[PDB]
Symmetry: C5
Subunit: 208 residues, 5 copies
C-alpha cells in the first residue's frame, strides 16, 4: 500500500517530469466531444444572450502517455491535475462572456495513453429567444472547436449526435425539445486549411 503509492509516484515522474508540444500536421490528434446539458439558466431577450450549464466530455489519446501496467504494479490509470498535461483549447465560438468553470480541473489518464477530461461550464452565448413562449419554442446554436488548430492538426468526432438530456434539471424554467451535436467544417479568413467544429443545436421553450 505504501508500495502502490510509490509506483504511481514513479510513473507520474517518468511520464511528466522527464520526457509534448501539442498536435501537428505530422502528429495529428482526434478529440472526441460529447455534451451533457444540465440547465438553461437564463434567456435574456433584451441582449440575446442565453446562459447554459452543461458538461463537456473530451477524450483523446497520446502515444507519449502510454505505459506498460506490469512495469508499474498493475496501475491501469490515474487521476491528474489538468495543468500537468496538454489539454485541447476547445472554445465556444459565439460566447459573450468568458466561460465559468464549475468543476475541478482534473483529468483521467489510462495506460493506453487515452485521456478523459470532463469540465462543467457556465456559458453565455449569442441566442435570440424569440418564441420561447410558443409551442415550437426557440432554437439556438453554438459551435465548439479548437481556436487555433486546423482540421489537419485536431480532428473532432462525436460518439453520438444526441446531446445527453438525462440529467437536465426537471424544474428548470425551460424544457428541452431537442438537442443535437453535429460535426462541421469551416474556413476562416486567416487560413487555407479547414477548421472543425461541433455545433450544439438546442430547441427549448418556457416550461408551462
Amino acid at each position: 500500500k505504501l508500495h502502490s503509492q510509490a509506483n504511481l509516484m514513479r510513473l507520474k515522474s517518468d511520464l511528466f517530469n522527464r520526457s509534448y508540444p501539442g498536435p501537428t500536421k505530422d502528429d495529428p490528434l482526434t478529440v472526441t466531444l460529447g455534451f451533457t446539458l444540465q440547465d438553461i439558466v437564463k434567456a435574456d431577450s433584451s441582449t440575446n444572450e442565453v446562459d447554459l450549464v452543461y458538461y463537456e466530455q473530451q477524450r483523446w489519446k497520446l502515444n507519449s502517455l502510454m505505459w506498460d501496467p506490469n512495469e508499474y504494479g498493475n496501475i491501469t490509470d490515474f487521476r491528474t491535475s489538468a495543468a500537468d498535461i496538454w489539454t485541447p483549447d476547445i472554445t465556444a465560438y459565439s460566447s459573450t462572456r468568458p466561460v465559468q468553470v464549475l468543476s475541478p480541473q482534473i483529468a483521467v489518464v489510462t495506460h493506453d495513453g487515452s485521456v478523459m477530461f470532463i469540465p462543467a461550464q457556465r456559458l453565455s452565448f449569442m441566442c435570440d429567444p424569440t418564441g420561447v413562449d410558443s409551442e415550437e419554442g426557440a432554437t439556438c446554436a453554438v459551435k465548439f472547436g479548437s481556436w487555433v488548430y486546423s482540421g489537419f492538426e485536431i480532428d473532432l468526432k462525436t460518439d453520438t449526435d444526441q446531446v445527453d438530456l438525462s440529467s437536465y434539471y426537471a424544474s428548470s424554467k425551460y424544457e428541452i425539445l431537442s438537442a443535437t451535436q453535429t460535426r462541421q467544417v469551416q474556413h476562416y479568413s486567416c487560413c487555407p486549411e479547414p477548421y472543425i467544429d461541433v455545433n450544439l443545436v438546442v430547441k427549448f421553450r418556457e416550461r408551462r
Copy 2:
C-alpha cells in the same frame, strides 16, 4: 526560549512530512479513502424565481485521514497538531453537481492536521444552485436538493460518509429572508455515462420558506 524550541520542532515536523516522501498523489483503488462530509447551513441569501437559482452560504466540514501524515508526538516536543495552508497538502475535489456559478470561498484556506494523520478542513462557501423556489411564499414552502461529491474519483477511490443526517442549523442567520423547515444530508450512489464505477455523493435537501 522553549518557544524557539517548539517553533523548531514544528518546522522540523513540517519538513519531515512534506519534503520526505512527497506529495501524495491522491487515493487509488489500492489505497481508497473515506471523506466525512457535514454541512452547516448559515443563510439562504437569495431565491431567484426568474432563473430558478438559489444562493446559500454554509460551511462544509471535510474530514479524512492519511497514513502519510502520521507522526509521533514525543519525537516533536509533544506536538499533537498543526495548521497549514491547504495548498500544502492534498484536499478532496468535492463539487456541487448542480451549481450554476463557480463557488465563492469566504474563509481562509487552512486545514488542521493531527498526529494520527487526520485532517480537518472547513471551507465556508457561497453557492448558487439549481432550485425552483415555487411554494416558498406558502405554508409548505419550497424544497430543494443539491448533491456533493468527488467529480473525478469513483466510490473505489473516495467513499463518502456523514456524521449525522441532520444539517447543522445552530448558526443559521436568525433574520434571513427565508426560514428553514428541514435540512438533511444523506449519502447516495450514482452512475455516469463515462464509467461503470459507482460515484458517491451526499445529497443536501432543504425545505424552506419566506419569513413571516
Copy 3:
C-alpha cells in the same frame, strides 16, 4: 551615497529576517495576541430583498513576533521597514457572516518595527448578513458581524482591542446612511463541540437613512 549603504543595510536586513531561520504561525506553546480596531468609512448599500449590507472599512491589525526583532545599530540604525504582506505571516482574521468574498481596497503592505511589532491596515469592502428593517425610521436598524481567526482558537491567537468604539471619524459625511452607534466588543465563548475558548470581536452597528 550614504543612500547606497542605507539601501544595502535594508536588503541585508530583509535576507537576515526572511531566509533565516522560521515562523509557522502561533501555537498553544507560542500564542500571540492580535490587537484589532475598525475604522468604518461607509455603509454603501442595504439590500432588504436579500438582507445583506455592504460596508467599507479598514481594519488596524497589530501583533509582535520575536522572529522579527533586530538591533538597529547592526543594520544602519534602521528602525522599521515597509514590506509586502506575502513575505510575512499574517493573521487569518475573517468575518463570520460574509455573503461574498471580501474585496481588498489597499495595498497588501505592512510595516515592521525592530522590536518585532508588525502593523497592517487592510481596507476592505464587505457584504454580510444583515436585516436593514427600520433604516427608514428614527430608531434605525441594527446589525452585527463578528471577526476572528477562522482556524486558531484562543489558545493560539488572542484578540484585544484598544477601545470598544468603532472609529467613525472618517465616516463618509454624505453616506446614504448615518451611524447612530458603532461598537466593537471582544467576546470569549466555548462551542461545546470543543473545550477550548474562542475569541472574536463583534461589530455592532446602528444606522438609518440620512435625513
Copy 4:
C-alpha cells in the same frame, strides 16, 4: 515513429528559439515593428443609454514579424510553423483607448509562428466602451467609435497597418438586437501630453441601429 521524431524536432526548435537570445525586448526606434490589425465584429450585445457604454464582441487579427523568430525548416524536419502559448513570446500591447471595463478575453491565448518569423495572434474579446447610443432606435441609427493602438509605443516604435478599411462582418450575429449599417477601421495618428512623438491607432467606427 517519425511522429516521435517530428515531436522531438519541435521540442528542439522551440527550445532553440525561446532560450536564445531570450526574451527579445520589444521594438525600439532603432528596431521598430509593424503590426497589422483587422477586426471581425460579432455582436453588439448591449447598448446602455443610462451610462453611455456599448458592449462589443469581436476578434482581432494581429500580425507582425520578428527576425529573432526565423528558422530554416530544413534544419528542423521541414517544420514550417507551430502553435505556441501567447505567454512564451512577445505580443503587442494593443489597447482600446476608451474602454470602461477591463476587456474580457474569450479565446485561448495561443499564437502561430511561421519560419520567416511572422506571428499571428487572434484574441476574441468582449469590450465595454464609451458610446452614446442616441439614435439607435431610428432609421439613421447611432454612430460610435473606439481607437485601438499601443499604449506605450510611439509610431517610431510601432506602426499599425490594416489590410482593408472594412471591418469583417461576415460573422456578424444574424439575430443580434443590433444591425450593422457600416463598420470601418482606419489608421490614424495622435499625440499625447506626455510625449513629443506621434502615436498610431486604428479607429473602429460602427453605425448601427435596433433591428426591426
Copy 5:
C-alpha cells in the same frame, strides 16, 4: 546592427535588474517624490441609490531612482526603454474613498529613462464615495477623492503635481455628464496610527448632467 541594438538593450536590462537586485522601496534616508497628474476621460455613472460615482481616468506617475541611471554610451546610445511594471518598483498610489477594487484598463508597462526617471501612466476605472445630488441642476454636484501612498509617510514618499488643473482635453464629449471643473491639489494628512504626516493629492470634480 539591430542585432546590436537588441544586444545592448538586453545587456542593460540585465544589469539593472540583476546585477544589483531588487530595490527595497524608499526610506526615510532614501526618500522619493512622485509627481502625479490626472486625465479625466469619463464620468460613467453616478448612483444615487448608493452615493457612488464611477470615473475612468489615467493617472500620470513620475519618480526617479538613482539605481536606475545608466550611461547611454556604455550601452549603444539607448536613452530609454519600455519595461513591464512588475520588473521595477512602483508606488502604491491608492484612492482613499474607493468602494470597489480599482480596475486596470491599460497594460502595465512603464518607461525608464537614463537619468533614472520613470513614467507610468495606468488607466483605471474607479468607484468612490460621492453624493451626486445637484447633478441635474445648473450648479451640478461636487465630489472629491484623495490619492496617495497607503503605507509610506511623507518622509518616504512625497507627492507633487505639475499643475492644479486636471487634464480635460480627452474628456469623452458625449458623456452623460459634463465637467464644470476639475482640480488636483497636494495635501498633508495625519492618521491616528502615526506621528508622521502622509501626503495625498486631492481630486475635486464638479459636474452635472449634459443637456
